Amino acid sequence: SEMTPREIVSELDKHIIGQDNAKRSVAIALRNRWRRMQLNEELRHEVTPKNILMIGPTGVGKTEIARRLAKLANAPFIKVEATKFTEVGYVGKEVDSIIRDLTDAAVKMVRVQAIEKNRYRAEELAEERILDVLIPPAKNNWGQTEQQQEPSAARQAFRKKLREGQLDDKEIEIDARKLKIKDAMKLLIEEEAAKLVNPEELKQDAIDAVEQHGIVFIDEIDKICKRGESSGPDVSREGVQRDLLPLVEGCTVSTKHGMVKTDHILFIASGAFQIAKPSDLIPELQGRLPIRVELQALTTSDFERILTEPNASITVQYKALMATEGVNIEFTDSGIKRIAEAAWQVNESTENIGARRLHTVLERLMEEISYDASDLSGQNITIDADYVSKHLDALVADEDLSRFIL
Amino acid sequence: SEMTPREIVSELDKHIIGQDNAKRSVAIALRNRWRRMQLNEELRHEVTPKNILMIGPTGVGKTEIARRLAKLANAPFIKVEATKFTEVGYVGKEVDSIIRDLTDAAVKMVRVQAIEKNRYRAEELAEERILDVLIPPAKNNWGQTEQQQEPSAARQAFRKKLREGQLDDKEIEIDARKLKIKDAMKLLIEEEAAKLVNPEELKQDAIDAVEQHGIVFIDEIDKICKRGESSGPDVSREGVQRDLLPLVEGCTVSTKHGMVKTDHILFIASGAFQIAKPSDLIPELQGRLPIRVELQALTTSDFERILTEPNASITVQYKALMATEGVNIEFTDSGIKRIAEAAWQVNESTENIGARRLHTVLERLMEEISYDASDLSGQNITIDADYVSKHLDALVADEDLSRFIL
Amino acid sequence: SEMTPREIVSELDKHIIGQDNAKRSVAIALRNRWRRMQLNEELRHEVTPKNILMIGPTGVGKTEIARRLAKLANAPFIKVEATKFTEVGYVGKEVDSIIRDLTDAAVKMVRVQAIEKNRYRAEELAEERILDVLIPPAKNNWGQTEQQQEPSAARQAFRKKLREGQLDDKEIEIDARKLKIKDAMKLLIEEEAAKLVNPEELKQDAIDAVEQHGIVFIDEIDKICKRGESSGPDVSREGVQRDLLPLVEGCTVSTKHGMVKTDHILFIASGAFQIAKPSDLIPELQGRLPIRVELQALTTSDFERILTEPNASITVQYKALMATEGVNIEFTDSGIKRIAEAAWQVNESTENIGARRLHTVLERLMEEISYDASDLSGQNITIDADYVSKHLDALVADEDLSRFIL
Amino acid sequence: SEMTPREIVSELDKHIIGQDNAKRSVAIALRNRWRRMQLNEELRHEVTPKNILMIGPTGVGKTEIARRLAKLANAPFIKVEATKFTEVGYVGKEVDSIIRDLTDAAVKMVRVQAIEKNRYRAEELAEERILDVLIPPAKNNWGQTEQQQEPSAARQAFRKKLREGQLDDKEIEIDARKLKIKDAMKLLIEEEAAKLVNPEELKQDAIDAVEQHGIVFIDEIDKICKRGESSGPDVSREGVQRDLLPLVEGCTVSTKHGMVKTDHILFIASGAFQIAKPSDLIPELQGRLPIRVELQALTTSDFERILTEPNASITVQYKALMATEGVNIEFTDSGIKRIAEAAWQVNESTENIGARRLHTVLERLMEEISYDASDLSGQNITIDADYVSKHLDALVADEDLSRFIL
Ligand SMILES: Nc1ncnc2c1ncn2[C@@H]1O[C@H](COP(=O)(O)OP(=O)(O)OP(=O)(O)O)[C@@H](O)[C@H]1O
Ligand SMILES: Nc1ncnc2c1ncn2[C@@H]1O[C@H](COP(=O)(O)OP(=O)(O)OP(=O)(O)O)[C@@H](O)[C@H]1O
Ligand SMILES: [Mg+2]
């Protein structure tokens, strides 16, 4: 019961732009899950996760692809920065935390997993107990087949009003106190929800989810490589590698949820490696990170697509926000293409993040509309190619200024 | 469970190519545990473990030999980076942790031993309780010799239905809560398995495990010797050697599961010793590491062998996974040759990382296939030397690339 | 339980060759506790103990004597490494630990002490309760002097059968259930075993083992002296001597097992003192180490004795372990002298590590036999001067190998 | 109600040898206590303690004089090392601890102080509750002037029997259980002593004792002075002075016993000042350490007196210890004089501690008797001048050896 290499890339194709290779890789990894759990007992142990190591610059999709991947398989996920554990110079943060955190993440996974499952039932019972105070039921009933006319037009009346209308004052009993529907409603929900939920029967779900589906994204694992010094003193970082193997090559670790294996968890490390090369990773890590994939630096089209396609692109969002003031914003193809060329420019000119650059540029170009929105009520402003250039040109052209306000 | 040296080396031979000297070393050790038992009280508690110190390059087998050695011995094992405690002014953990961890590992094993031993007894009584809800048994019974017709076609009915067919709804009491068979089953099993397991028995058992068969493996021991670039931080690395002394000389450490004595734990310290010499260790430690053995670098022939001969060889493992997709992979002998050859080349032209290299090369090689797979069910794909060159020659040629991908 | 100095030196002489003066010092320390134990209330607590300070090279027997003295004393022993507490840039655990550990160590002895002490009592009562089910005793009895004919030939019959024979099916009552002697026996043992064990006592019994018999061995008490190089770190070492004082002065520390008074713990400080001198210890501490004793470096003859005279000498150890495989090892006098000379020579040409060198040397010399043993069953192998030469001479000479193998 | 400068010195003259100056000084400070608490309210605030700073070598009486002084006024006391708080380079110990500790010290003062104070009261309330079970009192009573005939001959009967007689079986109620007077007595006493032990009525006793009579002995405050560096970097210590000011010039500090002032606690810091001079202390401290006193180095006579006079001199102690074996030791004037000259010699020759040196010398000189004591039963050994010189001469003469075994 699992998707496949290609079928996976499709799903990822519905959220990430470009980076097909990387996709194919997280695709395979995810598939080998369903491949192992499909073998004899003697192998299940022998075959270890095919960890992937992503190589690319920022703003190009790395981390998203992992989120999306873990999401795509509702798998416990966690993102850490290799350097977070480098503060060993004097401070102290230990790797165990990674898995430790992962489990938590899982317990929240499984938790929320039950809630949203029967949240309706709760709300139902919740509003099924608010009608009792509105129309004090006369003890004893039932007996015939009038289940349809049983709730009485009374309860049915307040029913419609409650879920769809006024009603915002009364007192409900718990353990009897005055309150208010809009809140007493959110008071019962949690209570009711309790009844449905279970306890120690969360272990073989969370610890299992983790140990069998968890995914870890180890960011900038390149910030913890060799470096110019010596393989002895500058170990303040190499030693951070020597601290991950246990996690990477199967070890254990106790958590406030029990014991977690880690023997076969999917690790996806990533770096730009524009200084150090994956080859500088200690041999144990090289060994355990078999799948190597390089991501490409984004292009204006990517940018153009990242501005539009996304169900919640900054574009749609902005339009949304200004509609709050009565203004009707509209980004036109040329406009978008233009914001796109604006980002690319700045990335190119100055330092180069990636899709990141879209935020300041867009918020910059809309400064005046953003400030004047209130007075632009009822108007229809359209951001075309003209607009954009006579707002962003001056700035983009000015590299120095770009390093500050863009 | 006590086999002879020559035999122990024969098992080891099944998962590790070459390194005979190392195999004999470890086998002698394992073997003495049986010899010591044949001894009288006095000697039995005078004869200590012949801790090993392995000397060799990376990816040649030092650790693999220790795992496999612990496995055929069925003993709680544990890897530890010597450096995990190093610091020129940092923090780190405490060495005793090594015994806490090893002990957890002993409990884990024991739990398993007992569960699978009487898993039936559990599942049995488990469903034996799911039938009671399905068919409320009328209090009081027995009396005659009708044991067959006693479970009444009623229970017998559900029983087949339950075990075989359909799993799916009701409410069973614990501490009365609606559930679902397919799940209430797993719930009851654990609940039932419990009653069977004797805590003190497994706690004591888990201990003897560690105390009488523990095998700890200290990697990168040479990363603790002298150095010379300082005085404090170096005699601080030495600090790690001092801290380990109690464990190797015999001491007691307190753990969740009780008090553990280290006097009979076998220690396998490993090291490349390219910079320092085993003579650079602190005397007390050199004293506690009687047996010394040097493992040798692997050769291309070795890689070919490593590729297919070991038991769950990566080759056989690849084939297994692919089969899951209905694909039949086969490796040409020359295919196997070109691969070992590619790896060697890279290890030679970049960073030599031993047998480890084989993984990365094998993954890259079979990626296009791995991604297709599903779309090749029923096909017999053969990896001949032509396939191995078309997919790796260029890569191997690009020394930069190899530093990134292979 | 208290013997004279002269007698302790006699016990000491069964395991440690030479170092008579030290055996004496230690002998006095011990007899001295018994003496203080003979005083009145007035002095019992107004008698400042006589901690030892051992001065000597490595591998000459300082630790050994303390251990073995702790054994004949049958006292919980612990061995601290003076430096563990220094840190010119670390945390360095706090000395409290020494009494902590010792206590954990005391507890163990006590536990396994009590058990193996009155085990017979349990197994006896255990089976004494299995005969009750075999031959249901008729209530009320006794009265005359028919004590040996009272158990009746019935109980006496099953008695012999039980401990020496069949009988493997029966149901016993605990808290009434069918079982099986083979296991119902063990089941009872632990149950009864409980009865005898006093948890409110042994905890105390532990403190009474510690506070009044506890021996501590502080090593490298010389790696704590002034030094000179700098000044900050020195007072950082001296910090350990300052902090060390209360223990040797006589105080109370708190453990997970209660409060413990360090007042009668015998302290054995020890050091090589190659760079530093006792006179360089902090005045407070010097005066608190009234008993001073030196140990002489060992000589080849000594090695030869260490090799054979001691009770369970490594020689008698190997010969024993080999006979376990049915091999008759005979060490010729010529063979011993060469082992001793080989060790001495390596200690001369590389790092001198005292008697420890004999271990590595002996092991190496014996590996081949040690591996082949099983197949050499029934044969005789004489380790004589010629035998020693073939196996060691090449290695001893090759100074680079000796820094790795011997 | 207080002694006087002279009268105090005498008390100190009863335990310390020489060092009259320092005595006269601690005397004065102690007296100013009784002088301030004797002035108008406006002054009591204005006048602060006249802190004393002792200047002298080790082994001459400093700390002893402070103990004796705090004892002489049963004042809370504490001795700290200035350097203890210098481990600030990387570790961490804070001065608050000092007062923090001081209070504890006080609560222990007041504690054993309270018990023996109202010990009678407890026992009374104890047996007063044991008669209730013996003669179950009839509820309701009193009313007339029959206080003498009220206890009834019944309670009065058991009263005498109890404290002076049999009665050793009964059950008392606590939290109702059978016991035995002989024990049921000691059980009630403590349990009763609890009610008395001023629960919260311990505050205005400890915090008061501390705040009004506390004495702090700050050892080696010279180890935290200027030093060759700069008044900015080497502040790792000068900053330690900047941390005592608060305490010395009155601040506060919270303790698990409440709040403590510190405004006027007597501080007695000391140092040898053979490197740094009191002039190097930061100005604030100099200001707050008004009384400056120099102690002199001990003399053989001092040594001679230190050996004999003390009610528990090492000499008496030894004679005692050996009597445990039947031997009758006797130090003769010439003998002691000789041990004195021997200590002085070594102090002079090598490094010079002080009285300290008496421990090893005496224990060295008695080595043989100490070892042979057992066989010397019934004999009368006399350590005269002869004995000593022909046991200690060769060693004292040998400076080098002196630095090790003396
Ligand atoms: N004969 C062999 N020699 C080397 N590696 C082998 C051999 N057979 C299989 N392998 C595999 O090669 C990898 C090498 O890892 P291993 O830890 O054994 O190397 P190592 O050099 O001993 O490591 P370390 O330097 O950390 O002690 C493992 O994944 C192991 O399973
Ligand atoms: N008479 C002896 N003299 C020296 N070593 C001996 C003797 N008998 C046995 N040995 C063995 O020699 C080794 C030396 O260890 P020991 O701890 O006694 O030396 P040490 O110099 O006191 O050590 P450290 O410097 O760690 O305090 C031990 O393995 C010990 O068992
Ligand atoms: Mg290694």
GROMACS .gro file of C-alpha atoms in nm, chain A residues 246 249, chain B residues 78-85 95 97-98 101 216-221 244:
model
   21
  246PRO     CA    1   2.540   0.697   1.653
  249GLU     CA    2   2.452   0.428   1.207
  484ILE     CA    3   2.814  -0.106   2.207
  485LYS     CA    4   3.020   0.128   1.992
  486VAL     CA    5   3.165   0.445   2.143
  487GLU     CA    6   3.370   0.720   1.992
  488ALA     CA    7   3.669   0.774   2.218
  489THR     CA    8   3.641   1.142   2.139
  490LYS     CA    9   3.285   1.162   2.267
  491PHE     CA   10   3.444   1.276   2.593
  501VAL     CA   11   3.234   0.774   3.063
  503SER     CA   12   2.735   0.625   3.024
  504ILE     CA   13   2.913   0.357   2.828
  507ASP     CA   14   2.403   0.220   2.739
  622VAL     CA   15   3.227  -0.261   2.448
  623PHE     CA   16   3.401  -0.122   2.136
  624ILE     CA   17   3.600   0.199   2.177
  625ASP     CA   18   3.664   0.352   1.838
  626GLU     CA   19   3.923   0.620   1.763
  627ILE     CA   20   4.122   0.538   2.074
  650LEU     CA   21   3.809   0.495   3.104
   0.00000   0.00000   0.00000
